[PDB]
Design a protein around this nucleic acid. Sequence first.
DNA 1: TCTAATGCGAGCACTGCTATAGCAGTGCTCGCATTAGA
Length: 1158
Amino acid sequence: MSDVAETLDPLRLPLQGERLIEASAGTGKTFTIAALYLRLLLGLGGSAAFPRPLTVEELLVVTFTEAATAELRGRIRSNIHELRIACLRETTDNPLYERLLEEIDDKAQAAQWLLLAERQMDEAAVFTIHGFCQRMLNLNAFESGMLFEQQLIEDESLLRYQACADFWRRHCYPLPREIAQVVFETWKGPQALLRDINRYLQGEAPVIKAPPPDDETLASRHAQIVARIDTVKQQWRDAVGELDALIESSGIDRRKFNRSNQAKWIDKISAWAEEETNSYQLPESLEKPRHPLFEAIDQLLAEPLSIRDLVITRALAEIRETVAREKRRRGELGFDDMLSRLDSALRSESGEVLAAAIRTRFPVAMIDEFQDTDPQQYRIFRRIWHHQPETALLLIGDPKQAIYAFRGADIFTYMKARSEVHAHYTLDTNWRSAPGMVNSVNKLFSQTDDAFMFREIPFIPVKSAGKNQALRFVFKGETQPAMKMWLMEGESCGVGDYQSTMAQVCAAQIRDWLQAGQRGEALLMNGDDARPVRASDISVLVRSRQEAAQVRDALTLLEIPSVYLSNRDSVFETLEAQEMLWLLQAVMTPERENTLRSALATSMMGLNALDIETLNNDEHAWDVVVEEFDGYRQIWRKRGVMPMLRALMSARNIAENLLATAGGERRLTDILHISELLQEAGTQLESEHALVRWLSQHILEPDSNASSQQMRLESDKHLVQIVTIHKSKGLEYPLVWLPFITNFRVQEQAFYHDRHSFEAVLDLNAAPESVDLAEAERLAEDLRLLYVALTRSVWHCSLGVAPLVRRRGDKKGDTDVHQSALGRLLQKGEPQDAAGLRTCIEALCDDDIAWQTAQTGDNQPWQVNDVSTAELNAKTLQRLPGDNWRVTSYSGLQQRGHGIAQDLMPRLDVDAAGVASVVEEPTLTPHQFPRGASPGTFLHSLFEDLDFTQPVDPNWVREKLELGGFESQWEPVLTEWITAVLQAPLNETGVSLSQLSARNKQVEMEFYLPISEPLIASQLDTLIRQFDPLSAGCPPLEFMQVRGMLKGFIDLVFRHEGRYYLLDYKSNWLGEDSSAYTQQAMAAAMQAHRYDLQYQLYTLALHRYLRHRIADYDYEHHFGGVIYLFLRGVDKEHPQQGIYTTRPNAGLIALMDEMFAG
DNA sequence: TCTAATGCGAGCACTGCTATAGCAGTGCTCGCATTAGA
Ligand SMILES: [Ca+2]
């Protein structure tokens, strides 16, 4: 509690409301969480226990990373599973669980509560801050105002930009030249506005110290300014007199130079700008009898004269709501909104029902990484858990590791929270690291008081663990110290030098380690165990993409391969993408001589200058490559981009060759990665060209997702690893290098946190008091970064130090090294001589801490060899293709195009297809009814459920046409059409659909015929011919061998008192008129679409079906069917026109039926 | 086949004056760090 937290003993920590746990670097934050979790599930503890035992769905644990929750969740399903087993056994011989066991009172019961929890884990309330938010939101959607169906907006950077241009458009275009020019001089365009405000606009809006009056228009301020400007433009258009008497030295007569300038600064304004008229003022006039009445210049140079704060203020207020409105309209949600709307929800009046709701679901909650919260979160958290009995709020984290300033993480809202909760705790021991390492860090950050210079972030030392007392690092002889400062010489030192030199030094010391390690003289030792240092143990922490390169370079210069683990580039701007783009163009059109030559020229294909030339002179060889490429397009068109690309590669033997070519692995895996992306994108485009286009776009405007990020190679694991301070939080490394840990960069933007109210304030006038406050907050941050930096190592760490100077003040005992975190701890605060550094370092310095001077080096080798025995081969299978079983359906016939057609709509009028034109003739006849399948299946629909029996309501019909989206005005023609077709004589004898009651029809029957013994198109042809006069029009056997099944739909099967029939309604073709629906023409079309096949198949179906249903049925006493109504060509009085009938041989069905089974 | 960043001061050169030297200010050349971080 109170002052200097208590050394948290997990097992006795009071799980009752509000506890702040500080877990220093390497202290067990994770082991502790776990323990606590178990304690809560089994309501263990004592007077320090929680009131009741909780469930998995009640222990709220929030983490920051998606990866964090996963890990955390994985770690907990394990401690449960174990504490549980150790509960059946009632014995544990491993730390935590034993002490816990001691605390348990009915092992038998725990084991069942635990077993339940284990089973529940797929729902543990372990979420990310955002996850926690959309959940509380979605449940209580009425309080929050949420939609039940939201779309998680992902970008928002483009949404923001667009809002920003809209802003500019509606606020600048309409502006008159005088104001316009002014704005223009403040920002050339909306891109530059955003550049100045983009940070804000995101997350909580800062408070503006001194905003403009809630109404000043651009127009107004302008006035005031102009007017302040011209009144002084008048009292100068009178330089008649200014030609003055009494002297001074500085002030020369080349003042007549200064003069005219402003005399001529009398344009029609348009710019708040005004080159220097220092001399002719009056404030200095005296500072250099003296001057007269232009004390109006003393007044112009007092008041700022700018449009800046005014426009800015307006922009963010507005740009924000543009973004907002847009996101609502689209129906979306960004991440900041998720937890933002949850804040506004706990603050609305309807905020108690909500706080209570939540508080009930989650009585106790563990917030991890808490040092990285921000006003919005904290507020969500106290409003729900603060001062609330029957609940507990464990906030665990470490203020010394709060480095996410740039994202939104507020160290001040952490410091406030620290004020509001009174129970403080700390983890005292540093498992994970060597004692010297632990000692020198503690020493370093112990120098001055308030090392992190914010009394609220006090630094308390830590003890090193016993299990690690034996760790030590030896090199070419004896134990090296845990922390070594390398120190450049000289008095001054620019940022550019201290880098070239430091990167140099750092790479040198690395091969020196690395090769002394191949020889056994650099050992990582734990007591009497030792292993040589490999590259997988060196690690270089770095502050930016540039520094990293600077390192990779000096390292590469010694042949020492490296990896920048924090690399963000995308695979789309890799040069390999460009080549893939040429390659695809080539494939999509090898016709164009030029675009192919380019693809063959890409380095990826590995050709020669001699190669390219000769292929240009050998026209037969070229058309060979052209075929090869036509071959690829084909695979592309059928199987995909990946499949095509793999074909190409196997041919030009790409992967094999590339890998042989230095750095060729990088390239090869990027190429594959592009293909994996290229393949998804293709399944969302129905053209190859579209994809190509898809590539270009991604090559011209990249860095989108984390998905187009570069994948790291398996092996990068044996490369020295160069990472950023940020990606290193969490990570552990045997040895680490800090080549540029002394750099600073003065904060110049006045965005600071108020020292008393702890809120964020943006000062739109760089008032020095605020920039000063901002700057403090800047090293307040670098110290935290330094603390994360020193802390990743286990055995050793060495950082580069230099008498760094940035002030262009001529080495005035400068060395503003005291403005860097490391500099501030070394020089205890006060600035020093370039030599005063050297003496401070020496000052804290024995075995644990030591220094050497930047001893540069050279020796291009990393003298390491190889050996290799590729004794490989691949399993070849000895089974073979043989036969294919399938489910077909009179598709053995109808060639594709129907790909996915029969799939999306199982009953589409597949028999139709096409457009319709200038056949409009001003009097509707059934031949002018919309052509094709959509309309075609509209018809079939008509006859699916009718009352063939009664007459045709025309209302009913107007409704069918109205619902199916056809013009009502078709009702006259259609109703007249339906009846005609109902009242026609199919088989002369009675017949006529109209005589068929329900009980005698079966619409759309669906059959499945097994067809064993492949059905060879030929063998079926012979008998089809013999028995059918129609199929005598012999082009058939157009399909290929198929064993399997045979699907099929029968439009209608009806009976006419003894005698079953097969009806097939066929809306079909727009062949002008009548002349096309006569017994031949039909019989004609019949063969065109080989529909004859359909009959025979369909009746073999009806045959089998009837035979199966009608016990003791005979084909020729019950069948006699097959009617084919070409719906069009059907008149009330022109029978045998439109209708077609057949009655399969009965001798055909016979053979046919057994042609299936044998 | 196209273009190719600013900007800030220094840094040295030179030019009035006026109680040879320091205080000042005019002007072109040039080197330097800039970004960051998920
Ligand atoms: Ca049909």
